[PDB]
Write a protein that binds this ligand. Sequence first.
Ligand SMILES: [Mg+2]
Ligand SMILES: [Zn+2]
Ligand SMILES: [Zn+2]
Ligand SMILES: [Zn+2]
Lengths: 105, 45, 161, 119, 99, 250
Amino acid sequence: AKHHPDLIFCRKQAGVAIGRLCEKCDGKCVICDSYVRPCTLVRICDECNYGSYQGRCVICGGPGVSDAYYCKECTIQEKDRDGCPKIVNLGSSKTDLFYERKKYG
Amino acid sequence: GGKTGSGGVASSSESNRDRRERLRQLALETIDINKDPYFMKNHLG
Amino acid sequence: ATVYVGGLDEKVSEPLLWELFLQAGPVVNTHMPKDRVTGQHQGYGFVEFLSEEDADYAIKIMNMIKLYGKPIRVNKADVGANIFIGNLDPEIDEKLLYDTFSAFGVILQTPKIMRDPDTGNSKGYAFINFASFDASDAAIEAMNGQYLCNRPITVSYAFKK
Amino acid sequence: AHKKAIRRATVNTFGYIAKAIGPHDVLATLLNNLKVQERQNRVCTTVAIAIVAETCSPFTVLPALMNEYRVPELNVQNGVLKSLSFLFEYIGEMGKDYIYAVTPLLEDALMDRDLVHRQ
Amino acid sequence: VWRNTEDEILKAAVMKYGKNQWSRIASLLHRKSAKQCKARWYEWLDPSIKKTEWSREEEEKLLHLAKLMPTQWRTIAPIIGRTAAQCLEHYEFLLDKAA
Amino acid sequence: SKKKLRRMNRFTVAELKQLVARPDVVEMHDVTAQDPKLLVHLKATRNSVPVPRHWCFKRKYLQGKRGIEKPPFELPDFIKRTGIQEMREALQEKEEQKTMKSKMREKVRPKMGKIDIDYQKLHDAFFKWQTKPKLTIHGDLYYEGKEFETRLKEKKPGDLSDELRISLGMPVGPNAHKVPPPWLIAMQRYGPPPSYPNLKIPGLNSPIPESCSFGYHAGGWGKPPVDETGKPLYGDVFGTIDRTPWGELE
Ligand SMILES: [Mg+2]
Ligand SMILES: [Zn+2]
Ligand SMILES: [Zn+2]
Ligand SMILES: [Zn+2]
């Protein structure tokens, strides 16, 4: 996601396991963060696909429901060729909002 | 008491846009009232 | 290499000035150092064109150059100081006449041939204001009675209207 | 709304009702929104103009965008720029007809009016 | 609090509208009420209020009064010509410089 | 200091300007580069593009563009033809006359189809009346103030203009060639200016431009310069393959 500079990709070698999206995350690209003309499917690292990690949102991490794609722009600049694009770190914002809430109510 | 045929009351966005316009006409007024040579409005408002 | 743009037309910009200097020669600088308040050109301007003979033929060509209609003077950088002239040639031109008589003084009037409106040929008469009355003395003394273009000249200080 | 599902759906239905009616009236009420001040609504109207233009062909809505870029506010000039960003990404390969209409606007914006103009 | 920018917009509003229409003046500002606009004008912004230093006549007054009518600053104040907050801070000031 | 040993390595600017094949290219600080011979060789390669002017400037870039006032964007001609401009002006003035009451009232009872514009004119404007603007060739970077340069290197007298001829008292338009500027009279009198041996005068050193007339009344081209034998003074004042494109649409 081109929006939050604080996060990081697995970046390790590809596989054959298609990638899946949570319902919040459904429909967007995984790097370009677009909403349009999706072209190719996502393939994820075996490690980042092993065990509990099967069938989750690459981005969200929740329960995967749909297959992730790459926009035509990522496909043309070949940014789909870098191996597992799973964000392997939670970020500041998740725990931040969580704590603001758990204080609020 | 009210009157019929009216529209509603403006939402925050329209009220704030009208506030900004009013604040602009105010300042053009007082800038004239002080005959200020030195002020200009550029093309970004 | 330096040229004085006098009579520099009130609105004739450095664009027109240097575009005329470039159309004649290697225009390396034109400048109207002007009235530091009104911004309009100073009625006096300094233009450097690198070549001396360029500046020379430029001054030769830019006499009576009509910037904003008014003749703009390019040269080296009204008490009645005029000479009237009789026995003039109808084959004469005013630019050529300024080139001829101007060595005794610059052209503070362009040499007007007193010619009728009916046909358009000269009547043998003309008038032009020089720079000085001493200039009128020199010009009319070195041009008095001598052989002009076609009719031997006859020139004296101006009779006024 | 604070929820992104609602705003996405809202923009889509601006597209649909532009398909039912013509584009002009919905597009006029959408340039007016670029006169607001909170950014989330203006970014969502910027995506809605892109959608209207892509459903009903871009040649209908371009002259009105390019003209709206002449009104003296920061937020509406960035509104029409961001709207073109979205529009060109949506229409994709058919950009090749409007690229020449657009470029004189972009060079004009890339000679600054603001940091955000150039961005 | 109040910022130079609000203050100058207030001054201009008041100078156009007058000192009894606080509700439209309060409509001109964001995050400000008519109660607060009025309080600010009559506490600090009014050009009748003087922000100088105390003539020692003014300070002998302040001391004499603040002893004769103790704790009554809105009553003391007009008898000497500055607002109650100024009188009060400057009075504590003399008290501690004297202590 | 080993820093000062690297400084002992630092050629003088004339050292550099000497060794390298093109010295013009060498600027001041070029000496301070950890590879000055490379740097200058790369500055002398064809078709490359020099760094932007403002890397040293202490003010930032168009933050300096700041001061003056600017006219609004100017629409292309092929978009003016369709008249969208005056349309949207009319609505802007109407809505500025509107007050909050009437604004909400039309939010609740719209005036549908108040005004319109036709298609097929938008369609002709984009698919049949479009034109290529003037583009910039490779390497013309922009900098603050590029657009307030009139032009330069225009050494040719034949290039006339409209404001020029107007405030000359000469006509612009199709009769520009038949319109003689104030310079041609003294051109025929004492040659072209002596930096321009190689300028040819319309009507004085070259033939009459088509449908212009040699003559000495108002609007003519004089008595053409020639010698006492009959040979013109400059040029000729009286006017003594298969370039088809190869694969092109019918
Ligand atoms: Mg009633
Ligand atoms: Zn998700
Ligand atoms: Zn993408
Ligand atoms: Zn992985």
